[PDB]
RNA sequence: UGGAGAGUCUGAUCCUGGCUCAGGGUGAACGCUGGCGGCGUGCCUAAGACAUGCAAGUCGUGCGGGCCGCGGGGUUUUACUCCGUGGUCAGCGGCGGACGGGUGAGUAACGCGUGGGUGACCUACCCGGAAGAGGGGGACAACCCGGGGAAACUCGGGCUAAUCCCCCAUGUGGACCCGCCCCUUGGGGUGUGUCCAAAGGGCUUUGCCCGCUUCCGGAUGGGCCCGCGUCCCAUCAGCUAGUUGGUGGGGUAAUGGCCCACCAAGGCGACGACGGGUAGCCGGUCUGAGAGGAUGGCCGGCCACAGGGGCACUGAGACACGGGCCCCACUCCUACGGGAGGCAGCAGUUAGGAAUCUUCCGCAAUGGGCGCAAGCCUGACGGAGCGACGCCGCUUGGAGGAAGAAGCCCUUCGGGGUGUAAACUCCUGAACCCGGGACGAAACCCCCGACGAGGGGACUGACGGUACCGGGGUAAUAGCGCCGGCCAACUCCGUGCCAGCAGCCGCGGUAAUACGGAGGGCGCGAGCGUUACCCGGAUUCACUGGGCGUAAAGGGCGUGUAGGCGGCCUGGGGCGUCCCAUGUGAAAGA
């Protein structure tokens, strides 16, 4: 018995906690941004959106989201905050988005 | 292991002289002299009109026993001729004639087929400089069939070649009698064989 | 090549979708007479353009739904309801031959 | 990674190889991309090695990796000679 | 280049008609018998259960240590402590455990075959090209301390390194929103805005090797989609609730009722839906004149499964045979609280079964993983072992030898047969002995040359002292079926509807060529017969290629739905049809 391929499993549970953590931030930031887009705060929503995006691409850097998955979440996020900003638009910061 | 036993009995059972005994199938002892009826207790009884199957059977046996071959190699050679281009009937005969043992006999190296088979088996035969101990080896045209110089001084070879002096050889063969050489010039034609056998009957024995 | 078939729209009753019936002629592999088989495709109609009885080309397309892999290329022949009548009648015979 | 190697097609005690382009992950006697040569190691015939250099050079421009022995036999047929 | 029929219904006939046989095949098994070698092949049943051993690791040129040992230092001595080095152990980290090996259970399905789509996508390592690597910060093992448990193991506290992790920067470039251009399904370009890079190690240490980062392309492997084809039952006729479609959303690499909410009421079926039975599919294989039937073992390609069922994690890739969690059944340990397992991997065991092998050698070759390399692992593989299981080659002697011994068998008692067969004469020389003795092996590596081309050189065997060669050399296994017709081979005696033979037709109730033995003969021969199964004959499911007055078969009659089929002329089209080119039709097999 006792293969030391078991080492692999020990590392699995390491990376599981790495991946799982960054995603949880992503979601918790993404929602946050949208919550202010719906609530018409433009500057704060865009400020948070830039941090969301940064966290997304940073998770693409490694083995969490590596593919165009990160680009998926970005796309959906920018669409949602722009459209939610369409209610009394006033895009104050205008940082994250294009003119 | 081929048929091994009394042979001049099959001389009788076929009704034709079978020279498998070599000599003494010539001297009036062959038992085809003054005993042309088949063997057994009922040999001298009046034989019944054979069935159409009986005819093709006795013709195939008449050929098979002549070349001294198991049924297995016999049929595999036949099916080989059935596939090859040309007349199945004569192609088969050319193939049987191409057996190294048969060539040896045919070149007058051996008194008989069987003797030719033993001579091949014991490696006394050269082919293009190489020893070949398989009686089944297919001779090609242009192959030199010699006698191993090891055995050239043996008294059986000098015995047979002594009587081969001035004896004529088949039109598809030629031999040098002093150096104990020989050559397979080409495949024999139907007319090149005096075989008392109807090939069509044999072909017709395998259609069933 | 994307496969392209020509058939007759036998169903209007969906939204943004039409059923196309496509005949097909081929010699029987053993008995050799020419037999006529036919298959129904669910084709995508984004503009609700094509109506019942239309004879339309249908093109192999990126999957739209379960059971929808074709889109309506163009209109061949407008509104010959005799085809639809053969299909409807044949459907209608099945109410017999049960009990 | 695509590789250039040998595939054994002789019989027992009689090996004959087929210099072959295949994915490293397939069986050695399994499905390959292209047969680009044969190798007879007992050298039974006058021609016991054939290569078609200019095809091997193709598969090397795209990064097939030859075995140590494949490279031995390729070099012998002059695949790498650049003069 | 290819096509044979026969027996059996009648007193006899012709026809119809089933049954039977001759042929070929097999992962075979059974009986008698059994000499050698080569190449193939070998659990078809319980996808039943498994003792034992091996079957996937590797890298010290990513990093820090523990234990055991040696040497050299700072000191007058000790204590303490610094550097070098050897062996070993794991740990942290990277690449590989998704290949390769096994099975045929599930599956009638885009599962497979075949031809395509992907403007709906992914692809580690490999190849080509562009560009870059600046600075800072942190943690968990190992280690040390402590606790619980019988054990498996487990919990807590503290220190620490890195090619582990994170923040800043730099923006070749890439990603996202929006706009514009060209394309046309989410393809390419562009603008503003936002977001995103990295790691070191080694020496022959000034330069180079192994790595690292972003991007484009290539190559390879793959996902998903579609047309067509894919067994039996209609004594299965109706099926369907995410079910069919829509809008939006979630998810994924990616389309998609894949999932979710809401809306519409749809979708499928006699061209066989739904249900039941059966089953991996193919390249092929077998048979057949072919059309066809049968089949999918070994080998190659695809799929599915890993005790049964579900599930996700890590990852380029798995929902993972030798990884994880849970439920169930079973075996084992158990301090009764709780634990450990998973040969359909190689051998091997047991069960079942008519039946299926060695607990073999080897890393020498080929191939695969890790490694700068040296090298390590590889029951993949290469070989050997067993089994007439198949195919093939080969031996049990050759030549002379009596108008013909003995024995046996028959007889008209004259003789006939076994039979040139034996004896016996001569010749050769399977076995076995002796010596020599391989190919498979040349690269990796070293040296010259620049670690390139090129040249040069060195180590490297399981099989195996086997193959093979040379010398010497002995007459040295034969069996099994059959002899009434089909079907090649006949007499004697024994037995008397007995004992029994038998594929079919039939033999035997005192003269049996059919039973049993013998003599003899026919057929094959290291085999020969038998049983089972497949095709053939069978034109006996009739496309090729049959029929229905009396032989089996016209619906009791009509009307008519679907479907099938369609008179003469002309014109368009060109769907079927025919022609040309072209891509495809893997390798093997043929
Ligand atoms: Mg490891
Ligand atoms: Mg939260
Ligand atoms: Mg993932
Ligand atoms: Mg012929
Ligand atoms: Mg001639
Ligand atoms: Mg025939
Ligand atoms: Mg509509
Ligand atoms: Mg849809
Ligand atoms: Mg209905
Ligand atoms: Mg593969
Ligand atoms: Mg050259
Ligand atoms: Mg013709
Ligand atoms: Mg009759
Ligand atoms: Mg009658
Ligand atoms: Mg009668
Ligand atoms: Mg009949
Ligand atoms: Mg036949
Ligand atoms: Mg048979
Ligand atoms: Mg025995
Ligand atoms: Mg063998
Ligand atoms: Mg099995
Ligand atoms: Mg089978
Ligand atoms: Mg061992
Ligand atoms: Mg000291
Ligand atoms: Mg030193
Ligand atoms: Mg050490
Ligand atoms: Mg150490
Ligand atoms: Mg270690
Ligand atoms: Mg595993
Ligand atoms: Mg596999
Ligand atoms: Mg299989
Ligand atoms: Mg079913
Ligand atoms: Mg299908
Ligand atoms: Mg398909
Ligand atoms: Mg395909
Ligand atoms: Mg640090
Ligand atoms: Mg620290
Ligand atoms: Mg640990
Ligand atoms: Mg701690
Ligand atoms: Mg701790
Ligand atoms: Mg990193
Ligand atoms: Mg730029
Ligand atoms: Mg920009
Ligand atoms: Mg940055
Ligand atoms: Mg750093
Ligand atoms: Mg592709
Ligand atoms: Mg959708
Ligand atoms: Mg994934
Ligand atoms: Mg719903
Ligand atoms: Mg249909
Ligand atoms: Mg099954
Ligand atoms: Mg054939
Ligand atoms: Mg036929
Ligand atoms: Mg089948
Ligand atoms: Mg089939
Ligand atoms: Mg098997
Ligand atoms: Mg299962
Ligand atoms: Mg399971
Ligand atoms: Mg990986
Ligand atoms: Mg699993
Ligand atoms: Mg699986
Ligand atoms: Mg296992
Ligand atoms: Mg108990
Ligand atoms: Mg048993
Ligand atoms: Mg074996
Ligand atoms: Mg040994
Ligand atoms: Mg090896
Ligand atoms: Mg190797
Ligand atoms: Mg390497
Ligand atoms: Mg090991
Ligand atoms: Mg093997
Ligand atoms: Mg036996
Ligand atoms: Mg004799
Ligand atoms: Mg002598
Ligand atoms: Mg060698
Ligand atoms: Mg050599
Ligand atoms: Mg140098
Ligand atoms: Mg060189
Ligand atoms: Mg080596
Ligand atoms: Mg040796
Ligand atoms: Mg010798
Ligand atoms: Mg002698
Ligand atoms: Mg004797
Ligand atoms: Mg017969
Ligand atoms: Mg007869
Ligand atoms: Mg009998
Ligand atoms: Mg009596
Ligand atoms: Mg009597
Ligand atoms: Mg009587
Ligand atoms: Mg008798
Ligand atoms: Mg009988
Ligand atoms: Mg008898
Ligand atoms: Mg007898
Ligand atoms: Mg034999
Ligand atoms: Mg047999
Ligand atoms: Mg039959
Ligand atoms: Mg038929
Ligand atoms: Mg019938
Ligand atoms: Mg029948
Ligand atoms: Mg009839
Ligand atoms: Mg009647
Ligand atoms: Mg009648
Ligand atoms: Mg009537
Ligand atoms: Mg009637
Ligand atoms: Mg007409
Ligand atoms: Mg019509
Ligand atoms: Mg016309
Ligand atoms: Mg046309
Ligand atoms: Mg063509
Ligand atoms: Mg081919
Ligand atoms: Zn004679």
UniProtKB/Swiss-Prot annotation, chain A:
What is the name of the protein in this document?
A: Small ribosomal subunit protein bS20
What top-level branch of life does the organism fall under? Bacteria
Q: Which UniProt keywords apply?
A: Ribonucleoprotein, Ribosomal protein, RNA-binding, rRNA-binding
> Do you know which NCBIfam families this protein is assigned to?
S20
Pfam families (UniProt xref): Ribosomal_S20p
Q: Which GO terms of the molecular function aspect are on file?
A: small ribosomal subunit rRNA binding; structural constituent of ribosome
Q: Where is this region: Disordered?
A: 1-25
A single Gene Ontology CC term: small ribosomal subunit
Quaternary arrangement and interactors, per the entry?
Part of the 30S ribosomal subunit.
Which gene holds the coding sequence for this protein? Answer: rpsT
Q: Which InterPro entries match?
A: Ribosomal_bS20 (IPR002583), Ribosomal_bS20_sf (IPR036510)
Q: Which organism is it from?
A: Thermus thermophilus (strain ATCC 27634 / DSM 579 / HB8)
One biological process GO term for this chain? translation
Q: Which family does it belong to?
A: Belongs to the bacterial ribosomal protein bS20 family.
Curated annotation (Swiss-Prot), chain B:
Q: Where does Zn(2+) bind?
A: 8, 11, 25, 30
User: What processes in GO biological process is this protein linked to?
Assistant: ribosomal small subunit biogenesis; translation
Q: Which SUPFAM superfamilies match?
A: Alpha-L RNA-binding motif
Q: Cellular component GO terms, alphabetically?
A: small ribosomal subunit
Gene3D superfamilies recorded for this chain? Ribosomal Protein S4 Delta 41, Chain A, domain 1, RNA-binding S4 domain
- Positions of the S4 RNA-binding domain: 98-160
Query: What Pfam families does this protein's entry cite?
Result: Ribosomal_S4, S4
Q: Which keywords accompany this UniProt record? A: Metal-binding, Ribonucleoprotein, Ribosomal protein, RNA-binding, rRNA-binding, Zinc
Q: Give the cofactor note.
A: Binds 1 zinc ion per subunit. In a number of structures (e.g. 4Y4O, 5FDV) a 4Fe-4S cluster is seen in place of the zinc cofactor.
Q: Which cofactor does it need?
A: Zn(2+); [4Fe-4S] cluster
A GO term for molecular function: metal ion binding
Give the HAMAP family listed for this entry: Ribosomal_uS4_B
Family classification: Belongs to the universal ribosomal protein uS4 family.
Assembly, in brief, is: Part of the 30S ribosomal subunit. Contacts protein S5. The interaction surface between S4 and S5 is involved in control of translational fidelity.
Per the entry, what this protein does is:
One of the primary rRNA binding proteins, it binds directly to 16S rRNA where it helps nucleate assembly of the body and platform of the 30S subunit. Binds mRNA in the 70S ribosome, positioning it for translation.
Q: What is this protein called?
A: Small ribosomal subunit protein uS4
List the gene name. Answer: rpsD
Swiss-Prot record, chain C:
What cellular component terms from Gene Ontology apply here?
cytosolic small ribosomal subunit
What is a single molecular function from GO for this protein? rRNA binding
Annotated coiled-coil segments of the chain? none
Q: SUPFAM superfamilies under this entry?
A: Nucleic acid-binding proteins
List UniProt keywords, sorted A-Z: Ribonucleoprotein, Ribosomal protein, RNA-binding, rRNA-binding
The knockout note for this entry states:
Increased generation time and a temperature-sensitive phenotype.
Keyword match Transmembrane: no
CDD domains referenced in this protein's UniProt entry, alphabetically: Ribosomal_uS17
Q: Which Pfam families match?
A: Ribosomal_S17
Keyword 4Fe-4S: yes or no? no
A single Gene Ontology biological process assigned to it is: translation
Q: Which InterPro entries match?
A: NA-bd_OB-fold, Ribosomal_uS17, Ribosomal_uS17_bact/chlr, Ribosomal_uS17_CS
Enumerate the HAMAP family for this protein: Ribosomal_uS17_B
Q: Which NCBIfam families match?
A: PRK05610.1 (NF004123), uS17_bact (TIGR03635)
Known partners and oligomeric status: Part of the 30S ribosomal subunit. Contacts protein S12.
Please give the family membership noted in the entry. Answer: Belongs to the universal ribosomal protein uS17 family.
Cite the PANTHER family for this sequence.
Answer: 40S RIBOSOMAL PROTEIN S11 FAMILY MEMBER, SMALL RIBOSOMAL SUBUNIT PROTEIN US17M
**What exactly does this protein do?**
One of the primary rRNA binding proteins, it binds directly to 16S rRNA where it helps nucleate assembly of the platform and body of the 30S subunit by bringing together and stabilizing interactions between several different RNA helices. The combined cluster of proteins S8, S12 and S17 appears to hold together the shoulder and platform of the 30S subunit.
Q: What is this protein called?
A: Small ribosomal subunit protein uS17
Organism listed in the record: Thermus thermophilus (strain ATCC 27634 / DSM 579 / HB8)
The organism's lineage is: Bacteria, Thermotogati, Deinococcota, Deinococci, Thermales
Curated annotation (Swiss-Prot), chain D:
- MF terms (GO), sorted A to Z: structural constituent of ribosome
What is any Pfam family matched here? Ribosomal_S16
Q: Name one GO biological process term.
A: translation
Q: Which Gene3D superfamilies does the record match to this protein? A: 3.30.1320.10
InterPro entries found in the cross-reference section: Ribosomal_bS16, Ribosomal_bS16_dom_sf
Q: Which domain of life is it from?
A: Bacteria
Tell me the keywords, alphabetical order.
Ribonucleoprotein, Ribosomal protein
What Gene Ontology cellular-component terms does the record carry? cytoplasm; small ribosomal subunit
PANTHER family tied to this protein: 30S RIBOSOMAL PROTEIN S16, SMALL RIBOSOMAL SUBUNIT PROTEIN BS16M
Show the HAMAP family listed in the entry.
Answer: Ribosomal_bS16
The protein's job, in short, is:
Binds to the lower part of the body of the 30S subunit, where it stabilizes two of its domains.
What's the subunit arrangement here? Part of the 30S ribosomal subunit.
Q: Which family does it belong to?
A: Belongs to the bacterial ribosomal protein bS16 family.
Q: Please identify the protein, giving its name as recorded.
A: Small ribosomal subunit protein bS16
